[PDB]
């Protein structure tokens, strides 16, 4: 039990750890599908490109916090094949001591093949992700002390519930960050994820969906959480406090819409890194908005670069020189 | 130029280096296919198993020769992601100094998802395999001296031609081992692979196909090669010499028909290992037949085990104690 050497500002990121394997088929899938007998297909596609991206929401968020110089621990389940991904993350300052490594299953994987007309054939292999339910946050606390925040990201549904319950039991501040799981969890399951959250993150459609499925009003939710953070795509972000105060921050203008994948994760990482560095709500949202645009301008989710001077200049363009100065003061 | 420290009995294995990623879909693909609009599909399958196997014909053959204690160099093209596969092979005594590593492409990959009714949806990514055409056997010769034999396995078609031509140019004994490529190369292309071969390996259907496509008679082929080796599935193997002598060796009886994948590669490896250890044609075919059955009884192609005592006993059961003694005398 670590009593004398506890961590000072650690964000523990729970959620999915996966990779994405993306292949291109130069022709049309319809060429083999049209003559096919659909009750027992035999389809074989000669592809001409393979791209592999490191991912999972927890991997993406931990990567970004690490790159930005935050203190971060990745807490999710992966397979033995996680080894190279572990080295990648450690090189960016991510503590991976509390990643559970399955004895039997491989790291989760999304595989997608896309044809010339944008038809798609995909698979989802959850693998080791299902073992995240076996992770004990109590073990993290024993090792490094209470984290400053535990992010409850999209994951094995049971793990999301168990992690939330354990944060309540242990008295750990948590962020409810269910993102895409809102479109698959029941109202009952979603209601279990919310009470006591320091932060609730969603996009605007997901916010509406949360209210619809839970049967809760906005007021019912606000009475249970310390801050609602709702991203609005090109319209920016709303930060809504339970006192009825709203802070709205616009986006950092992009130079390309290269790939929206991982942008939400990047916003959350930048925002929470700002919060852990002592920035207020507005400044933290400004930082999150910069990290979001860097990811938007990059193919994949962890394939973006961090350049300090470019960040300062772009923050100044979007938000003025004073805001930029205050943000970069806590960065390097 | 290595003149004073040349290799003594090295088999250089050329051919494909790949991995196979096999996934299981617990339901029926027809469930999503029947209601689908085939001119632009959007299919997404939640799978519940992923198995990855190390493969490619050259990888399989090199693995087996290494396990059996032969001197072997793998000569094919792979991507940077070959690193773990390289370590796997080196641990079994395979020299990988002459594997070409692509700067841009990944190791070749076969991906296949199978449903409950044995419907299949697969992809083939050649990746780095196409760069095997850039390998120079002259570089192998500079490093280790002339190999005892170069196996021309299934590969990038251009690489198969170029390697054969280079063996002729450099005066290197070669085995024509085109296997599955016989069903995709033209008669003209196949004819270029044969003249001067120390060995021609095929199965029985492939032999018929070779004759059909080339327009050659058996006599036309036999006049050009030193030995024809034709596997006959459960009926064993024929070894046919250009003098009209035929040696037929039966199989080693199996205890299961677990997975026929890689059995041909295993036979070739065991046979050629026997030849390099000084065994005659019959004894070499007996050894090849043992390695073949071990692979038949194993899922995957390099996931079988080598046990010396079990090998001796099984050889004795199939071929008698005298043959077994003569074979194990050159093994360990």
Curated annotation (Swiss-Prot), chains A, B:
Top EC group: transferase
Give the disulfide map: none
Instruction: Spell out the reaction equation it catalyses.
Output: adenosine + ATP = AMP + ADP + H(+); adenosine + GTP = GDP + AMP + H(+); dGTP + adenosine = dGDP + AMP + H(+)
Q: Which residues form the active site?
A: 265 (proton acceptor)
- Give the record's keywords alphabetically: ATP-binding, Kinase, Magnesium, Nucleotide-binding, Purine salvage, Transferase
UniProt binding sites for ATP: 203, 231-236, 264
Top-level taxon of origin: Bacteria
Would I find Kinase among this entry's keywords?
yes
Q: What does this protein do?
A: Catalyzes the phosphorylation of adenosine to adenosine monophosphate (AMP). Can also catalyze the phosphorylation of the adenosine analog 2-methyladenosine (methyl-Ado) to methyl-AMP, the first step in the metabolism of this compound to an active form that displays antitubercular activity. Is not active on guanosine, inosine, deoxyadenosine, cytidine, uridine, or thymidine. Prefers dGTP and GTP to ATP as phosphate donors in vitro.
Q: Cite the PANTHER family for this sequence.
A: ADENOSINE KINASE, HEXOKINASE FAMILY MEMBER
Query: What's this protein's name?
Result: Adenosine kinase
């Amino acid at each position: 039990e670590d009593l004398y050497f506890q961590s000072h500002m650690t964000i523990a990121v729970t959620g999915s750890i996966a990779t994405d394997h993306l292949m291109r088929f130069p022709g049309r899938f319809s060429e083999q599908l049209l003559p096919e007998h659909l009750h027992k297909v035999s389809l074989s596609f000669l592809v001409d490109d393979l791209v592999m991206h490191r991912g999972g929401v927890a991997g993406n968020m931990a990567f970004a916090i690490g790159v930005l110089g935050g203190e971060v621990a990745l807490v999710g389940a992966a397979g033995a094949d996680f080894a190279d991904y572990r080295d990648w993350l450690k090189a960016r300052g991510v503590n991976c001591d509390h990643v559970l490594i399955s004895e039997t299953a491989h790291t989760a994987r999304f595989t997608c093949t896309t044809d010339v007309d944008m038809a798609q054939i995909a698979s989802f292999y959850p693998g080791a992700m299902s073992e995240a339910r076996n992770i004990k946050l109590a073990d993290v606390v024993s090792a490094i002390g209470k984290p400053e925040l535990v992010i409850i990201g999209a994951n094995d549904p049971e793990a999301m519930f168990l992690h939330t319950e354990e944060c309540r039991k242990l008295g750990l501040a948590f962020a409810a960050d269910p993102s895409q799981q809102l479109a698959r969890l029941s109202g009952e399951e979603i209601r279990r994820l919310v009470n006591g959250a320091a932060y609730l993150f969603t996009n605007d459609y997901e916010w509406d969906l949360l209210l619809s499925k839970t049967g809760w009003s906005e007021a019912d939710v606000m009475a249970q959480i310390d801050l609602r953070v709702t991203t609005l795509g090109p319209k920016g972000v709303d930060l809504v406090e339970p006192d009825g105060t709203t802070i709205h921050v616009g986006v950092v203008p992009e130079t390309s819409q290269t790939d929206p994948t991982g942008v939400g994760d990047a916003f959350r990482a930048g925002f929470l890194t700002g919060r852990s560095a002592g920035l207020g709500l507005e400044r933290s949202a400004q930082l999150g908005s910069l990290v979001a645009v860097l990811v938007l301008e990059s193919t994949g989710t962890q394939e973006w670069q961090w350049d300090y001077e470019a960040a300062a200049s772009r923050l100044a363009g979007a938000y003025g020189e004073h805001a930029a100065a205050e943000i970069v003061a806590v960065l390097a």
